[PDB]
Amino acid sequence: SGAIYVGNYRVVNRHLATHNDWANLVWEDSSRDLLVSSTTAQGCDTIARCDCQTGVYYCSSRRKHYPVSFSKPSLIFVEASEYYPARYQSHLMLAVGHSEPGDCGGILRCQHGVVGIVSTGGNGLVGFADVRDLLWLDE
Ligand SMILES: C[C@H](C(=O)N1CCC[C@H](C(N)=O)C1)c1cncc(F)c1
Ligand SMILES: [Zn+2]
Numbered sequence: 001s002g003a004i005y006v007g008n009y010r011v012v013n014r015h016l017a018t019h020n021d022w023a024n025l026v027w028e029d030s031s032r033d034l035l036v037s038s039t040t041a042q043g044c045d046t047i048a049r050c051d052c053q054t055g056v057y058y059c060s061s062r063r064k065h066y067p068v069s070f071s072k073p074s075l076i077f078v079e080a081s082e083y084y085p086a087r088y089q090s091h092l093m094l095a096v097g098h099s100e101p102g103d104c105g106g107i108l109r110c111q112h113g114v115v116g117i118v119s120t121g122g123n124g125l126v127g128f129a130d131v132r133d134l135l136w137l138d139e
Pocket of ligand 1: 015033078081083084089099100101102103104118119120121122
């Protein structure tokens with residue numbers, strides 16, 4: 001679990017969104033596993049606007065942060081689950097690192113700010129849904 005709080009927005013994995021998230025829906029994209037809902041309290045996370053491929057992510061299953069090199073956002077195959085059929089997930093970045101069910105939502109950050117959130121894993125890999133292209137989060 002986990003979320004990004006920026007301005008009057010909350011960014012979460014679409015498959016983990018709550019009833020409150022859907023009742024205050026701003027935008028969602030099943031192909032990216034992202035949902036953005038509106039908030040009453042002001043968020044103070046900063047979003048990165050860059051092409052970094054190195055950063056640090058929070059891994060809940062280890063209660064630790066790990067440094068990673070990660071790929072450029074791209075269309076990557078994701079296996080079937082109770083939330084989605086087998087499909088290509090867009091804007092996804094892979095890294096070699098530990099992740100297991102429960103880790104979705106952990107933030108990936110670089111020196112510029114928040115890059116994205118854990119969305120996939122398995123096999124000594126971890127996948128992050130990028131948010132750097134969502135320029136409207138800042139306004
Ligand atoms: C199996 C699971 C996963 O990648 N999912 C399930 C939940 C929906 C995900 C999606 N983006 O469609 C795909 C997982 C395995 N290891 C680490 C994780 F953080 C997660
Ligand atoms: Zn950066």
